[PDB]
Design a protein around this motif. Structure first.
Motif, PDB file in Angstrom:
ATOM      1  N   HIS A   5       0.857  -1.228   0.000  1.00 26.48           N
ATOM      2  CA  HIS A   5       0.000   0.000   0.000  1.00 26.48           C
ATOM      3  C   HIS A   5       0.875   1.254   0.000  1.00 26.48           C
ATOM      4  O   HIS A   5       1.989   1.249   0.487  1.00 26.48           O
ATOM      5  N   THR A   6       0.360   2.325  -0.531  1.00 20.61           N
ATOM      6  CA  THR A   6       1.126   3.607  -0.565  1.00 20.61           C
ATOM      7  C   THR A   6       0.242   4.726  -0.018  1.00 20.61           C
ATOM      8  O   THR A   6      -0.812   5.013  -0.554  1.00 20.61           O
ATOM      9  N   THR A   8      -0.508   8.535   0.551  1.00 19.93           N
ATOM     10  CA  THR A   8      -0.121   9.911   0.147  1.00 19.93           C
ATOM     11  C   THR A   8      -0.908  10.861   1.041  1.00 19.93           C
ATOM     12  O   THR A   8      -2.105  11.015   0.883  1.00 19.93           O
ATOM     13  N   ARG A  18       4.565  11.202   0.935  1.00 19.84           N
ATOM     14  CA  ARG A  18       4.164   9.956   0.258  1.00 19.84           C
ATOM     15  C   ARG A  18       5.018   8.838   0.847  1.00 19.84           C
ATOM     16  O   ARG A  18       6.195   8.729   0.554  1.00 19.84           O
ATOM     17  N   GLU A  25      -1.753  -0.039   6.649  1.00 18.61           N
ATOM     18  CA  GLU A  25      -1.370   1.288   6.081  1.00 18.61           C
ATOM     19  C   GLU A  25      -1.306   2.359   7.170  1.00 18.61           C
ATOM     20  O   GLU A  25      -0.254   2.894   7.439  1.00 18.61           O
ATOM     21  N   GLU A  56      -8.610   9.735  -2.153  1.00 17.19           N
ATOM     22  CA  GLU A  56      -9.023   8.437  -2.750  1.00 17.19           C
ATOM     23  C   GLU A  56      -8.535   7.266  -1.898  1.00 17.19           C
ATOM     24  O   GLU A  56      -7.676   7.399  -1.050  1.00 17.19           O
ATOM     25  N   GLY A  57      -9.125   6.131  -2.118  1.00 17.05           N
ATOM     26  CA  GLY A  57      -8.772   4.912  -1.333  1.00 17.05           C
ATOM     27  C   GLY A  57     -10.015   4.482  -0.554  1.00 17.05           C
ATOM     28  O   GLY A  57     -10.852   5.290  -0.196  1.00 17.05           O
ATOM     29  N   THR A  88      -7.727   0.401   3.024  1.00 19.63           N
ATOM     30  CA  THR A  88      -7.076   0.791   1.740  1.00 19.63           C
ATOM     31  C   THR A  88      -7.027   2.317   1.639  1.00 19.63           C
ATOM     32  O   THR A  88      -7.973   2.940   1.195  1.00 19.63           O
ATOM     33  N   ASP A  89      -5.937   2.924   2.029  1.00 19.70           N
ATOM     34  CA  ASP A  89      -5.842   4.414   1.943  1.00 19.70           C
ATOM     35  C   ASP A  89      -4.839   4.817   0.865  1.00 19.70           C
ATOM     36  O   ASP A  89      -3.654   4.562   0.967  1.00 19.70           O
ATOM     37  N   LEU A  90      -5.323   5.427  -0.168  1.00 16.37           N
ATOM     38  CA  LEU A  90      -4.454   5.851  -1.294  1.00 16.37           C
ATOM     39  C   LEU A  90      -3.956   7.285  -1.075  1.00 16.37           C
ATOM     40  O   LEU A  90      -2.773   7.560  -1.126  1.00 16.37           O
ATOM     41  N   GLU A  91      -4.865   8.193  -0.829  1.00 15.98           N
ATOM     42  CA  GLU A  91      -4.484   9.618  -0.599  1.00 15.98           C
ATOM     43  C   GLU A  91      -5.445  10.258   0.408  1.00 15.98           C
ATOM     44  O   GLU A  91      -6.647  10.128   0.288  1.00 15.98           O
TER      45      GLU A  91
END
Ligand code: FES
Length: 98
Positions: A5-6, A8, A18, A25, A56-57, A88-91
């Motif tokens: 996971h990444t 941001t 980032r 996460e 997002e995420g 699930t955390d994207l940004e």
């Protein structure tokens, strides 16, 4: 085997990062495990001032005192970084901004 996971996360106060974190996460756990050491605030779910935002995420965010206030209208208002689920955390934006 495991899902990478990444995260941001940029604070509208003026911070932008980032990082990388797998399985768990959690912007605090990941950047606490990477090298930085952040912290939301009281984590009591009763201030309603920390109006954070989610870019997002599918990560989750549930208030603490839901029996005092429902987090729906508060979620559709914005997002809170006081719970922050590692699904699930994207940004994500931080709970501060100005
Ligand atoms: S509920 Fe207290 S700052 Fe988030």
């Amino acid at each position: 085997m495991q899902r990478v996971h990444t995260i941001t996360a940029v604070t509208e106060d003026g911070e932008s990062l980032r990082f990388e974190c797998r399985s768990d996460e959690d912007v605090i756990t990941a950047a606490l495990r990477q090298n930085i050491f952040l912290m939301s605030s009281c984590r009591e779910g009763g201030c309603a001032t920390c109006k954070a935002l989610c870019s997002e995420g599918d990560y989750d965010l549930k208030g603490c005192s839901v029996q005092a206030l429902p987090p729906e209208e508060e979620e559709e208002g914005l997002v809170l970084l006081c719970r922050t689920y590692p699904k699930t955390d994207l940004e994500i934006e931080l709970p501060y901004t100005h």
